[PDB]
Each structure stands twice: as structure tokens, then as C-alpha cells.
Amino acid sequence: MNIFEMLRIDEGLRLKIYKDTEGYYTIGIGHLLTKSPSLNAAKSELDKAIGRNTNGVITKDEAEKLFNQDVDAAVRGILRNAKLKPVYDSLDAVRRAALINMVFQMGETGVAGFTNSLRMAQQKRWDEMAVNLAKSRWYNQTPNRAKRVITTLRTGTWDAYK
Numbered sequence: 001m002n003i004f005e006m007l008r009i010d011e012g013l014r015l016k017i018y019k020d021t022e023g024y025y026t027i028g029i030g031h032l033l034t035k036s037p038s039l040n041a042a043k044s045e046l047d048k049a050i051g052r053n054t055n056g057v058i059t060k061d062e063a064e065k066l067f068n069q070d071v072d073a074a075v076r077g078i079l080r081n082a083k084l085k086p087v088y089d090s091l092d093a094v095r096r097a098a099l100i101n102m103v104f105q106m107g108e109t110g111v112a113g114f115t116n117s118l119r120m121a122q123q124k125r126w127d128e129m130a131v132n133l134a135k136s137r138w139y140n141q142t143p144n145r146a147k148r149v150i151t152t153l154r155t156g157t158w159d160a161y162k
């Protein structure tokens with residue numbers, strides 16, 4: 001198991017523009033296109049992202065390309081985040097994957113807000129951190145996914161994904 005496989009599981013793969021759990025225009029493997037209610041705005045964003053006139057449909061390779069780019073950006077944004085970096089550095093390899101997933105789904109700013117859970121993570125207070133993470137909108141909105149990530153983060157193993 002690794003980050004790519006982990007997110008491929010949580011995000012799925014879709015070759016056609018679709019709406020995510022929050023109603024936004026997405027495509028590929030969890031690639032947000034826009035928050036605007038406009039399909040056309042979405043189509044515009046897609047062609048610009050791909051570099052061609054897509055007509056709302058992309059190939060697997062294309063999806064996978066956005067995916068690489070997106071994981072890369074998540075890692076890099078963690079590493080440059082003054083609140084995130086220190087947490088990341090303190091974690092083992094599995095737990096780091098979990099921090100990446102959360103950043104991928106909710107953005108750097110979003111995660112940086114989980115101040116209290118971040119302090120716990122850094123203190124290696126596993127069970128308390130998990131409890132706290134669960135008291136969130138993120139958990140109430142996407143509980144199964146959230147559950148998988150929290151377990152990962154709590155335990156440092158891939159059990160929730162096997």
C-alpha cells in the first residue's frame with residue numbers, strides 16, 4: 001500500500017466530468033475543477049488543465065497525469081506550510097500518507113485548522129487525536145472515508161484499507 005493506491009481507493013476514477021460529494025465539478029481521481037455552478041465554467045477549466053478541447057471527457061492517462069500533479073502539490077504544500085511541516089516531520093511513513101490524503105481532500109488551509117488534533121498528533125497522543133478528529137464536519141460529511149484516514153493516522157498501519 002502507498003499514497004497513490006490509498007487515494008485511488010478513496011477517490012475513485014471517473015473519466016467524465018462529475019459532481020463530488022459537495023456538488024462541485026470534478027474529474028479523474030478527485031481533481032476539483034471548480035466551485036462554480038457552471039458546467040461550462042467546468043469545461044473551460046478542464047481544457048486549460050489538459051491542454052486540449054476535451055468536451056468533458058479525458059483518457060485514463062490524462063486522469064493519472066492530473067493525479068500525479070495533485071499528489072505532488074499536496075506534499076509540497078505540506079512541506080512549505082509552517083503549521084503542517086512540523087507535524088509531518090514528526091510522523092512515521094504510514095501516518096504521513098494519511099496527512100497527505102487529508103490535504104489532498106481538504107486543502108492545506110483546511111487541515112492547518114485542525115489545530116488541536118495537530119498538536120496531539122505531534123505529541124503522539126493517538127487515541128485522543130482520533131477522538132478529536134471525529135468531531136468535525138469532515139467526519140459528519142464523509143464518515144466512511146474519514147474513518148479510514150483516522151484509523152490510519154491513529155494506528156500507523158494500513159489495516160483500514162486492506
Ligand SMILES: [Cl-]
Nearest residue numbers: 048049050066
Ligand atoms: Cl491543473
Ligand SMILES: [Cl-]
Nearest residue numbers: 142143144145
Ligand atoms: Cl464516506
